Design a protein around this ligand. Structure first.
Ligand SMILES: Cc1ccc(NC(=O)NC(N)=O)cc1C(=O)N[C@H](C)c1cccc2ccccc12
Ligand SMILES: [Cl-]
Ligand SMILES: [Cl-]
Ligand SMILES: [Cl-]
Ligand SMILES: [Zn+2]
Ligand SMILES: [Zn+2]
Ligand SMILES: [Zn+2]
Ligand SMILES: [Zn+2]
Length: 314
């Protein structure tokens, strides 16, 4: 009976000492077992494993509670999906580009690089400690865990084609946007005027126009009476807003937005780049950086700063 000592965890915070039989697989002793993302369930302990930390699927109430406290999910597949993604994201390169942690292109990850760049430029606090901790580590240049968690929380695998707006939508549902409030007014010739209040994610996202200004002035929406009506923003309380539309040629002016998603090619299988407004316009394409004083190109998301806005419309 030869044995080594290892640590098991679900969160990489709470470590549990184990003595493992080197004649039995990790799986026979712990159930599903991972070493920095690699599935070692069907592998026997090696000497070099001595004192290393292994992730294991929770197999008692104590570990299921630790997993809920860290990830805010009880989904038994979550840990396996996180580890599957981490097994690739730990091999990606995360260069600093224009003071931001980017990702060198691999495994169709352009949407993920564009999201990661965006998240470093808007004010957001994540509810699950796993996401908040990884977000801090990503900002400091170590983004492998954050990217793997984003894939797991969005139900996406490495290589799957992803949409930045859909990814941000899922992440915002895991963020504290409770204080965020949007008041809209809908004006119809027939039904008259009606005001509604949105909160959380629905208060910071709009689909239909890239222009925050145009949203303030009013956009043409269908009324249930059949008529076109005008929707406009009455009041916005949020640290940012995200304006999205199907990709179209659009002019980005230095100092009038925070950052934007460029999308080139066909529906689903195209390529994202990230435009950021600094002292001039920077285009971050994974590891690649270009700058220009002007920009016109196919934009699908624009992010803007906000604190408190109240319309002057009567
Ligand atoms: C790249 C990508 C991955 C997954 C999705 N997902 C998707 O369509 N999911 C869905 N309908 O459930 C969309 C895109 C996508 O093409 N998004 C761009 C920004 C896009 C969004 C909306 C309308 C479009 C029309 C033409 C081309 C791209 C368009
Ligand atoms: Cl743990
Ligand atoms: Cl929750
Ligand atoms: Cl949550
Ligand atoms: Zn414990
Ligand atoms: Zn939660
Ligand atoms: Zn890979
Ligand atoms: Zn009406």
């Amino acid at each position: 009976v030869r044995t080594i000592k290892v640590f098991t965890t679900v969160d990489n915070i709470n470590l549990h000492t184990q003595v493992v039989d080197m004649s039995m697989t990790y799986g026979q002793q712990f159930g599903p077992t991972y070493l920095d993302g690699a599935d070692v369930t069907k592998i026997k302990p090696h000497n070099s494993h001595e004192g290393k930390t292994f992730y294991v699927l929770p197999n008692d109430d104590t570990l299921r509670v630790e997993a809920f406290e860290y990830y805010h999910t009880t989904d038994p597949s979550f840990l396996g999906r996180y580890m599957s993604a981490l097994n690739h994201t730990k091999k990606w390169k995360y260069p600093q580009v224009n003071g931001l942690t980017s990702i060198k292109w691999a495994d169709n990850n352009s949407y993920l690089a564009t999201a990661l760049l965006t998240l470093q430029q808007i004010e957001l606090k994540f509810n699950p400690p796993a996401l908040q901790d990884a977000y801090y580590r990503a900002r400091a240049g170590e983004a492998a865990n954050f990217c793997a968690l984003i894939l797991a929380y969005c139900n996406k695998t490495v290589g799957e084609l992803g949409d930045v707006r859909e990814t941000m939508s899922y992440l915002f549902q895991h963020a504290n946007l409770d204080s965020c409030k949007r008041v809209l007014n809908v004006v119809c010739k027939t039904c008259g005027q009606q005001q509604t209040t949105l909160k959380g994610v629905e208060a910071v996202m709009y689909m239909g126009t890239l222009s925050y200004e145009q949203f303030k002035k009013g956009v043409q929406i269908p009324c249930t009476c059949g008529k076109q009506a005008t929707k406009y923003l009455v009041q916005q309380e949020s640290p940012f807003v995200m304006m999205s539309a199907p990709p179209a040629q659009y002019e980005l002016k230095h100092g009038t937005f925070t950052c934007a998603s460029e999308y080139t090619g066909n529906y689903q299988c195209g390529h994202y780049k990230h435009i950021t407004s600094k002292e001039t316009l920077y285009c971050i394409d994974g590891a690649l950086l270009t700058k220009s004083s002007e920009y016109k190109g196919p934009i699908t998301d624009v992010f803007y700063k906000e604190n408190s806005y109240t319309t002057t419309i009567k």
